[PDB]
Design an enzyme around this catalytic site. Structure first.
Site, mmCIF file in Angstrom:
data_model
loop_
_atom_site.group_PDB
_atom_site.id
_atom_site.type_symbol
_atom_site.label_atom_id
_atom_site.label_comp_id
_atom_site.label_asym_id
_atom_site.label_seq_id
_atom_site.Cartn_x
_atom_site.Cartn_y
_atom_site.Cartn_z
ATOM 1 N N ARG A 133 -5.655 5.620 0.576
ATOM 2 C CA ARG A 133 -4.656 4.540 0.637
ATOM 3 C C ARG A 133 -4.863 3.716 -0.644
ATOM 4 O O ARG A 133 -6.002 3.375 -0.983
ATOM 5 C CB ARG A 133 -4.840 3.637 1.833
ATOM 6 C CG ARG A 133 -4.562 4.352 3.162
ATOM 7 C CD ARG A 133 -3.079 4.653 3.353
ATOM 8 N NE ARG A 133 -2.785 5.170 4.683
ATOM 9 C CZ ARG A 133 -2.776 4.479 5.819
ATOM 10 N NH1 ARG A 133 -2.918 3.162 5.765
ATOM 11 N NH2 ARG A 133 -2.525 5.126 6.960
ATOM 12 N N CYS A 142 -0.044 10.458 9.842
ATOM 13 C CA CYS A 142 0.890 9.935 10.864
ATOM 14 C C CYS A 142 2.328 10.078 10.372
ATOM 15 O O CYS A 142 2.614 9.717 9.213
ATOM 16 C CB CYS A 142 0.599 8.464 11.184
ATOM 17 S SG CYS A 142 1.758 7.739 12.391
ATOM 18 N N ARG A 167 2.629 -7.386 12.913
ATOM 19 C CA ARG A 167 1.243 -7.031 13.253
ATOM 20 C C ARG A 167 0.404 -8.299 13.237
ATOM 21 O O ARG A 167 0.806 -9.353 12.739
ATOM 22 C CB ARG A 167 0.702 -6.037 12.212
ATOM 23 C CG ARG A 167 1.411 -4.691 12.218
ATOM 24 C CD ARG A 167 0.871 -3.810 11.087
ATOM 25 N NE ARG A 167 1.574 -2.533 11.120
ATOM 26 C CZ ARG A 167 1.091 -1.364 10.736
ATOM 27 N NH1 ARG A 167 -0.149 -1.248 10.263
ATOM 28 N NH2 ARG A 167 1.869 -0.297 10.846
ATOM 29 N N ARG A 222 0.834 -1.199 0.000
ATOM 30 C CA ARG A 222 0.000 0.000 0.000
ATOM 31 C C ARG A 222 0.868 1.248 0.000
ATOM 32 O O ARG A 222 1.959 1.232 0.588
ATOM 33 C CB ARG A 222 -1.029 -0.020 1.129
ATOM 34 C CG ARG A 222 -0.526 0.027 2.560
ATOM 35 C CD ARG A 222 -0.158 1.422 3.055
ATOM 36 N NE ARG A 222 0.017 1.398 4.502
ATOM 37 C CZ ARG A 222 0.714 2.287 5.200
ATOM 38 N NH1 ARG A 222 1.425 3.268 4.643
ATOM 39 N NH2 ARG A 222 0.741 2.114 6.536
ATOM 40 N N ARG A 249 3.857 0.538 2.748
ATOM 41 C CA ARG A 249 3.910 -0.609 3.653
ATOM 42 C C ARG A 249 3.700 -1.844 2.802
ATOM 43 O O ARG A 249 2.616 -2.046 2.258
ATOM 44 C CB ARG A 249 2.872 -0.522 4.800
ATOM 45 C CG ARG A 249 3.177 -1.567 5.881
ATOM 46 C CD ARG A 249 2.294 -1.335 7.107
ATOM 47 N NE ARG A 249 0.987 -1.997 7.058
ATOM 48 C CZ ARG A 249 0.789 -3.303 7.330
ATOM 49 N NH1 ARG A 249 1.854 -4.105 7.532
ATOM 50 N NH2 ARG A 249 -0.435 -3.833 7.359
ATOM 51 N N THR A 281 4.697 8.076 10.798
ATOM 52 C CA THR A 281 5.235 6.781 10.365
ATOM 53 C C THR A 281 4.958 6.542 8.879
ATOM 54 O O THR A 281 5.592 5.650 8.301
ATOM 55 C CB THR A 281 4.594 5.597 11.111
ATOM 56 O OG1 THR A 281 3.201 5.507 10.806
ATOM 57 C CG2 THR A 281 4.810 5.732 12.617
ATOM 58 N N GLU A 329 -2.520 -3.880 12.541
ATOM 59 C CA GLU A 329 -1.899 -3.420 13.779
ATOM 60 C C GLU A 329 -2.871 -3.496 14.948
ATOM 61 O O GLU A 329 -4.092 -3.349 14.812
ATOM 62 C CB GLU A 329 -1.356 -2.003 13.598
ATOM 63 C CG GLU A 329 -2.429 -1.015 13.132
ATOM 64 C CD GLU A 329 -1.961 0.419 13.204
ATOM 65 O OE1 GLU A 329 -0.779 0.692 13.499
ATOM 66 O OE2 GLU A 329 -2.789 1.322 12.911
ATOM 67 N N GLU A 368 -7.533 6.844 7.532
ATOM 68 C CA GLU A 368 -6.495 7.583 8.202
ATOM 69 C C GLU A 368 -5.881 8.648 7.320
ATOM 70 O O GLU A 368 -5.593 9.764 7.774
ATOM 71 C CB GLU A 368 -5.406 6.582 8.670
ATOM 72 C CG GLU A 368 -4.208 7.293 9.265
ATOM 73 C CD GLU A 368 -3.211 6.310 9.847
ATOM 74 O OE1 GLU A 368 -2.020 6.666 9.895
ATOM 75 O OE2 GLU A 368 -3.616 5.202 10.252
HETATM 76 N N1 LIG Z 1 -0.222 -9.209 3.299
HETATM 77 C C1 LIG Z 1 -1.523 -9.025 3.638
HETATM 78 N N2 LIG Z 1 -2.462 -9.849 3.198
HETATM 79 C C2 LIG Z 1 -3.761 -9.710 3.490
HETATM 80 N N3 LIG Z 1 -4.220 -8.699 4.231
HETATM 81 C C3 LIG Z 1 -3.315 -7.845 4.675
HETATM 82 C C4 LIG Z 1 -1.970 -7.955 4.444
HETATM 83 N N4 LIG Z 1 -1.297 -6.987 5.093
HETATM 84 C C5 LIG Z 1 -2.253 -6.256 5.703
HETATM 85 N N5 LIG Z 1 -3.463 -6.754 5.470
HETATM 86 C C6 LIG Z 1 -4.727 -6.172 5.955
HETATM 87 O O1 LIG Z 1 -4.663 -4.791 5.795
HETATM 88 C C7 LIG Z 1 -5.659 -4.211 6.689
HETATM 89 C C8 LIG Z 1 -5.138 -2.958 7.272
HETATM 90 O O2 LIG Z 1 -4.209 -3.305 8.339
HETATM 91 P P1 LIG Z 1 -3.347 -2.149 8.940
HETATM 92 O O3 LIG Z 1 -2.429 -2.822 9.932
HETATM 93 O O4 LIG Z 1 -4.163 -1.011 9.419
HETATM 94 O O5 LIG Z 1 -2.479 -1.679 7.696
HETATM 95 P P2 LIG Z 1 -2.466 -0.385 6.676
HETATM 96 O O6 LIG Z 1 -3.428 0.667 7.220
HETATM 97 O O7 LIG Z 1 -1.020 0.016 6.703
HETATM 98 O O8 LIG Z 1 -2.914 -0.885 5.363
HETATM 99 C C9 LIG Z 1 -6.159 -5.332 7.549
HETATM 100 O O9 LIG Z 1 -7.431 -5.830 7.176
HETATM 101 C C10 LIG Z 1 -5.133 -6.437 7.367
HETATM 102 O O10 LIG Z 1 -5.566 -7.721 7.614
HETATM 103 N N1 LIG Z 2 -1.759 3.501 11.509
HETATM 104 C C1 LIG Z 2 -0.645 4.039 12.010
HETATM 105 N N2 LIG Z 2 -0.244 5.274 11.683
HETATM 106 N N3 LIG Z 2 0.075 3.281 12.816
HETATM 107 C C2 LIG Z 2 1.206 3.832 13.607
HETATM 108 C C3 LIG Z 2 0.638 4.672 14.790
HETATM 109 C C4 LIG Z 2 -0.553 4.032 15.479
HETATM 110 C C5 LIG Z 2 -0.879 4.642 16.855
HETATM 111 N N4 LIG Z 2 -1.047 6.102 16.776
HETATM 112 C C6 LIG Z 2 0.285 4.353 17.820
HETATM 113 O O1 LIG Z 2 0.957 5.319 18.214
HETATM 114 O O2 LIG Z 2 0.508 3.176 18.129
HETATM 115 MG MG LIG Z 3 -4.199 1.029 9.036
#
Ligand SMILES: Nc1ncnc2c1ncn2[C@@H]1O[C@H](COP(=O)(O)OP(=O)(O)O)[C@@H](O)[C@H]1O
Ligand SMILES: NC(=[NH2+])NCCC[C@H](N)C(=O)O
Ligand SMILES: [Mg+2]
EC number: 2.7.3.3
Length: 356
Positions: free
Chosen positions: A228, A270, A308, A125, A279, A272, A313, A224
């Site tokens: 994305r 954020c 995670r 992503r 990611r 990060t 997360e 967020e």
């Molecule tokens: N490699 C992956 N395969 C399947 N689902 C994934 C994978 N990595 C993350 N996810 C999914 O992405 C979603 C968002 O998770 P999150 O930790 O908030 O990550 P982000 O916001 O960085 O995309 C969740 O539903 C999680 O299960």
């Molecule tokens: N979705 C994110 N930006 N993850 C990283 C920060 C998440 C949360 N604010 C923490 O400090 O743990």
């Molecule tokens: Mg997320």
């Protein structure tokens, strides 16, 4: 800044100091000096230090604990952002600048687990913010609606593999929403860290998900970050996943103006998520390395990876499936970020095969 906000700030600083086992980067880096240096400052949009730190004050279990209400905040409250960004991203000095966008040579990316016994799925992503709109805590309802229209109308022009449909969260059936979240496609509802950052006002207005019919290309609207942009599929073909993401992001960038900063690269809510915003993750089973989870996390950290849970997360692993991804996003190129995931996951699988 008004006294009420100063009062709340002094109480939050106190609460952080008193929380002896809090391990957030907010607590670590908000020294009395840093705090006094910026607690009376305010952005042009009226963001104060309280807006920046409230999520980390209220959620003492935060890993980071701060967000930027607007772009200006990254500099107005620089004395707090700068050390936190340097720490989280594994080195990013005051004089450093994030490099230009560089996807790299995609043909150097490989299949991460050809025999298919460890990796369940692979995902990459990025995030983007629309030029002219601040981050979530500064948005009005009407702005959420404007942004949704702009992004969904743009995504109606995607073609070929990326062609798809926008599904607003307003009006989405509970069953469909829950299935899309259970299937790892749609963002969760009700994240306490985002809520206390005032990032979820007016929910679900303006929020939704675009996806192609196969659900290999998705865009989240107004979670967020404003966008994305996601590519994912079962298995370990990172090359395919990454190339689809590149195609999509380059095409969307040609259509929508996104916020980019000379020092911080692409802006996100954020710290990060700055820089590459990238990611790259797998859902992976590694039963021997995860048996003592401290070994899993310690191994991952030496490869600059984060662990995670299966639902993202702040969640647990289910059925031994971990989400493992590059942790660093700023001060390295997109290519370098995706390669930290590739290189680390190939070695963790080698270690799992070699383990007793
Ligand atoms: N490699 C992956 N395969 C399947 N689902 C994934 C994978 N990595 C993350 N996810 C999914 O992405 C979603 C968002 O998770 P999150 O930790 O908030 O990550 P982000 O916001 O960085 O995309 C969740 O539903 C999680 O299960
Ligand atoms: N979705 C994110 N930006 N993850 C990283 C920060 C998440 C949360 N604010 C923490 O400090 O743990
Ligand atoms: Mg997320």
């Amino acid at each position: 800044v008004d006294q009420a906000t100063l009062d709340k700030l002094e109480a939050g600083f106190k609460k952080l100091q008193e929380a002896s086992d809090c391990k957030s980067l907010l607590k670590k880096h908000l020294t009395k000096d840093v705090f006094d240096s910026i607690k009376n400052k305010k952005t042009g949009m009226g963001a104060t230090l309280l807006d920046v730190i409230q999520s980390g004050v209220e959620n003492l279990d935060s890993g980071v604990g701060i967000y930027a209400p607007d772009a200006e905040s990254y500099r107005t409250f620089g004395p707090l952002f700068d050390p936190i960004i340097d720490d989280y991203h594994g080195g990013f000095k005051l004089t450093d600048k994030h490099p230009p966008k560089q996807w790299g040579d995609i043909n150097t990316l490989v299949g991460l687990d050809p025999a298919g016994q460890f990796i369940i799925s692979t995902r990459v992503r990025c995030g983007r913010s629309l030029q002219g709109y601040p981050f979530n805590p500064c948005l009005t309802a009407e702005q959420y609606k404007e942004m949704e229209e702009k992004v969904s109308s743009t995504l109606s022009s995607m073609e070929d593999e990326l062609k798809g449909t926008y599904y607003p969260l307003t009006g989405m059936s509970k069953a469909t929403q829950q299935q899309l979240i259970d299937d790892h496609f749609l963002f969760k509802e009700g994240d306490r860290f985002l809520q206390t950052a005032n990032a979820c006002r007016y929910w679900p207005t303006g929020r939704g998900i675009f996806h192609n019919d196969a659900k290999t290309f998705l865009v989240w609207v107004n979670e967020e970050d404003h966008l994305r942009i996601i590519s994912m599929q079962k298995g370990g073909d990172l090359k395919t996943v990454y190339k689809r993401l590149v195609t999509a992001v380059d095409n969307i960038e040609s259509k929508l103006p996104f916020s980019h900063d000379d020092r911080f690269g692409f802006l996100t809510f954020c710290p990060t998520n700055l820089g590459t915003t990238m990611r790259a993750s797998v859902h992976i089973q590694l039963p021997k390395l995860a048996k003592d989870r401290k070994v899993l996390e310690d191994i991952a950290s030496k490869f600059n990876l984060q662990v995670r849970g299966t639902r993202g997360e702040h969640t647990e692993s289910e059925g031994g499936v971990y989400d493992i991804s590059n942790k660093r996003r700023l001060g390295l190129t997109e290519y370098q970020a995706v390669r930290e995931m590739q290189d680390g996951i190939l070695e963790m699988i080698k270690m799992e095969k070699a383990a007793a």
